[model samples]
Target: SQIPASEQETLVRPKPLLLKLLKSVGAQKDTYTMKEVLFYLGQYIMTKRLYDAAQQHIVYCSNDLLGDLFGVPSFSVKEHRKIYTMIYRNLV
Candidate 1:
């Protein structure tokens, strides 16, 4: 028999704040990788229409959830990686 332990490497337990924030978007996970977080976060952004209609590259974070996360009113959609790197602080 082979010991196969895949799909658990990058997963991490989230902090209380991140847990609450993720729960708001229906992502109830005890552990999550950044990719999964990004997927759910993208869904939330789409649900909230955070992306600018005219400029898809820009995202206007008008909601409090994202505001608290990024501490910014708006930012580029391309900043997901960098933003989440900062957000990785919310790991348990």
Candidate 2:
């Protein structure tokens, strides 16, 4: 019980705990507390807005978050070419 846990699990697993925050806040937002945000340089209505942004990307960001597609997160008529670049980049 005295030993420290593995660092890799600590660092890597948080990416899901991040999602749990959304469901929590969604229910308790009127009762207790938290805000939504994401960080790059720094910093998420958080999950709601985030999910909204993701919805936008279902049409787009498909290409932008990847290698050659890593450009603007927005989509356009001309940008349609890159969607198939990654056939299965699902969250699963």
Candidate 3:
């Protein structure tokens, strides 16, 4: 059975701290801020819940499946040279 959109929204909505962490991690060129890292670790528990829901077909699977879907070689390409240049410029 398809989950109601409202319930799905509620289920996927992370706490404020979690949103902050995900944004911080996504923004990171290297290491995440301490607060971000801590919140990310907490997300493991939440991930377990999602896994269970998907297993039971209570909810559709939605996770960061890219890392496994695409091997390391696929990620090593320079698609964002401009971003890389900006990061490298700041580093040096």
Candidate 4:
């Protein structure tokens, strides 16, 4: 599953909301865990115009499955951070 560095370069750009969230969290001057990063990203995404498009898919899914796979119904910035941290730690 190795991807070329060039491909990775194409994939790493921050979403606009992500950038804003990063600023909101004052992440520019310090290192943050992946959980911190993803949670903020999720919060940013939810409040943006794109949420309407994205919500269509999420809304149709069963709540039990959603909770099991994605944690909870409402997106919590803290919960997202924790989940991202766990994922990143396992990957590393």
The predictions' CA RMSDs to the true structure, in order, are 6.3, 14.4, 17.0, 12.6
Clashes of 1: 0
Candidate with the larger lDDT of 3 and 4: 4
Q: What digit string (tens of lDDT, one per residue) describes model 2 on residues 1-92?
A: 22123311122211233334433444222111111111210111222232244354433333323222234443332333242222112111
Local accuracy of candidate 4 as per-residue lDDT tens digits, 5-80: 3432332334444444456645572334444555554554444422345544332222432233334454433443
Clashes of 2: 6
TM-score-based ranking: 1, 4, 3, 2
| TM-scores of the candidates in the order shown | 0.73, 0.17, 0.22, 0.32
Supply the global lDDT for candidate 3.
0.34
**Winner of 3 and 4 under TM-score:** 4
Write down the worst ten-residue block by lDDT for model 2: 33-42
Clashing pairs for model 2 are 36-44, 36-46, 37-44, 38-43, 38-44, 39-43
lDDT of 1 by residue, 39-89 (tens): 776777788888877898876885657767767777886765556665676
TM-score, candidate 4, is 0.32
Instruction: Write down the worst ten-residue block by lDDT for model 3.
Output: 68-77
lDDT of each: 0.70, 0.27, 0.34, 0.41
Question: How many pairs collide in each candidate, listed in order?
Answer: 0, 6, 0, 1
Which regions of candidate 1 deviate over 4 angstroms?
1-9
Lowest lDDT 10-mer window, candidate 1? 1-10
Give the winner by lDDT: 1
